[PDB]
Amino acid sequence: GAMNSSNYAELFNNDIKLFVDDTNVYRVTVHKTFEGNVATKAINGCIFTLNPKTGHLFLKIIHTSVWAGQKRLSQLAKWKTAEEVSALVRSLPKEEQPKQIIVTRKAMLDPLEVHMLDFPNIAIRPTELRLPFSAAMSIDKLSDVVMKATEPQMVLFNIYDDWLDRISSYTAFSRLTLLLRALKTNEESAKMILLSDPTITIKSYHLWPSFTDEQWITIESQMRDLILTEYGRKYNV
Amino acid sequence: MNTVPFTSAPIEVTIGIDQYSFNVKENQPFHGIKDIPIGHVHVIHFQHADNSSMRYGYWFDCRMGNFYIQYDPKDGLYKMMEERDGAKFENIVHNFKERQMMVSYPKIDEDDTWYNLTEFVQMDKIRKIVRKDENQFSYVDSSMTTVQENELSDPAHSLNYTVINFKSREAIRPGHEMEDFLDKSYYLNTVMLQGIFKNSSNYFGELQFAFLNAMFFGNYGSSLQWHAMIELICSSATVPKHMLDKLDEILYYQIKTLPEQYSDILLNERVWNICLYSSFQKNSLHNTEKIMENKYPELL
């Protein structure tokens, strides 16, 4: 059944699993027309498919051409997501195929179950966790490859950089979710915290800065403070 | 007009014959049911006064043989049996009629209720859903499970309704996943009507049989089957116009007949709300929508 606080360590066991987030698949700017009506313009999107144990991120870029001449795009976006995840699973060798796919939004369950009928042994699960994967487009290198795409494209990343050399998957996932939670709550503040000290750089093959163990503790402290402040403000507590 | 004699009534029981029912007392001189309309399938059903659990009964057609009921004190139930000796049977029935020990099938002349509930139901189709080929009649009860229920355990005593599953390879063509899931016309028209049922009459026949088993025996798997067959039609954008017109009539008489007090366990809120208000056919079932809105507005 559903993934929650109670069955959290299952994410870091040796059963292959993927999180799928569809929140950045269909993206629009809303604008006024000459006649003063409102219209949308689609912009490039992405499926965020993540192995939480390894950090492997399968970023399927969704080019605006896929929406051309289609109706009910928010509904189509769920089915396109399920079609692309299904095509990804079929592209992987049998020993690399996931035993579970966890969708971050319940509306993905039926589209994914129907696209994966060929894989009756792959469990399709919801989660009660409120995961901040919508903030993936606040990671500058991910945002850049999506916005420059001129055609459909799959790009592979490790969202943990080299952290797994020093920390466990559990700890790597906790750092990732804290960084994304910060970026989602106050993007400008979060990005100031990450880049303020120009001596710490982002390696060409990495997404995040090259912090020491000590500098990560300070960074992680600054992100928790950012999140609690914004909470007090949101709620006047 | 045909007769189903009873050897005796040793135990106190509520006897149903189609939509009618009679209380019989322990050792009441009751010898059966006469004036049964020829031309239709019938069901004769039982609920013991001492165990209101296990409704059970027998689907039959008097054109297919001479049937009687006899209590079996070992198995503790009223059993249907065939009498092969035509003369012994006419002789038994004539005696019981002369002594007026039989209830009369109480049809009102104006009243087409039973025809309207059984229009497409044929004994030969009932005998394929309820497999017991040595009898010409079919036993059903409250507890019998469906082939589909057994997949999710004794196959001899199962209801072999056609398996409908909206999230199955049968229902969904590779490469038309979204199309076939949101518009079930492919599944209804090609797989089910052309492929399995052969025509809409057999489809309606199973639907009507599933409803009647749900209503008369509170058979939960039959209720699931009735709703699945409704939802497959209402979830198809493309349905022959005669099928929609006939489905509206079928469902109208089913909703009309359903006991008011059983609406809560026999009607699935999600299916009815979807079929009348969201589905492709939301504007195609005028009679059914009007009777549902006036009789069960709570459900909606």
Swiss-Prot record, chain A:
It is found in: Nucleus. Residues 7-237 are annotated as: RNase H homology domain. Changing residue 21 to N: Reduced growth at 30 degrees Celsius. Strongly reduced growth at 16 degrees Celsius. Changing residue 22 to A: Reduced growth at 30 degrees Celsius. Strongly reduced growth at 16 degrees Celsius. Strongly reduced growth at 35 degrees Celsius. Present with 468 molecules/cell in log phase SD medium. The MPN (JAB/Mov34) domain has structural similarity with deubiquitinating enzymes, but lacks the residues that would bind the catalytic metal ion. Contains a region with structural similarity to reverse transcriptase, presenting the classical thumb, fingers and palm architecture, but lacks enzyme activity, since the essential metal-binding residues are not conserved. Functions as a scaffold that mediates the ordered assembly of spliceosomal proteins and snRNAs. Required for association of BRR2 with the spliceosomal U5 snRNP, and the subsequent assembly of the U4/U6-U5 tri-snRNP complex. Functions as a scaffold that positions spliceosomal U2, U5 and U6 snRNAs at splice sites on pre-mRNA substrates, so that splicing can occur. Interacts with both the 5' and the 3' splice site, as well as the branch region. Has a role in branch site-3' splice site selection. Associates with the branch site-3' splice 3'-exon region. Also has a role in cell cycle. Component of the U4/U6-U5 tri-snRNP complex composed of the U4, U6 and U5 snRNAs and at least PRP3, PRP4, PRP6, PRP8, PRP18, PRP31, PRP38, SNU13, SNU23, SNU66, SNU114, SPP381, SMB1, SMD1, SMD2, SMD3, SMX2, SMX3, LSM2, LSM3, LSM4, LSM5, LSM6, LSM7, LSM8, BRR2 and DIB1. This is Pre-mRNA-splicing factor 8. The gene is PRP8.
Curated annotation (Swiss-Prot), chain B:
The modification Phosphoserine is found at residue 236. InterPro entries: AAR2, AAR2_C, AAR2_C_sf, Aar2_N, AAR2_N_sf. GO terms for cellular component: cytoplasm; U5 snRNP. Gene3D superfamilies: 2.60.34.20, Aar2, C-terminal domain-like. It is found in: Cytoplasm; Nucleus. CDD domains: Aar2_C (cd13778), Aar2_N (cd13777). The modification Phosphothreonine is found at residue 257. Belongs to the AAR2 family. Present with 7330 molecules/cell in log phase SD medium. Heterodimer. Interacts with PRP8 (via RNase H homology domain and MPN domain), competing with BRR2 for the same binding site. Component of a U5 snRNP complex that contains at least the U5 snRNA, PRP8, SNU114, AAR2, SMB1, SMD1, SMD2, SMD3, SME1, SMX2 and SMX3, but is not a component of the U4/U6-U5 tri-snRNP complex. This is A1 cistron-splicing factor AAR2. It comes from Saccharomyces cerevisiae (strain ATCC 204508 / S288c) (Baker's yeast). The gene is AAR2.
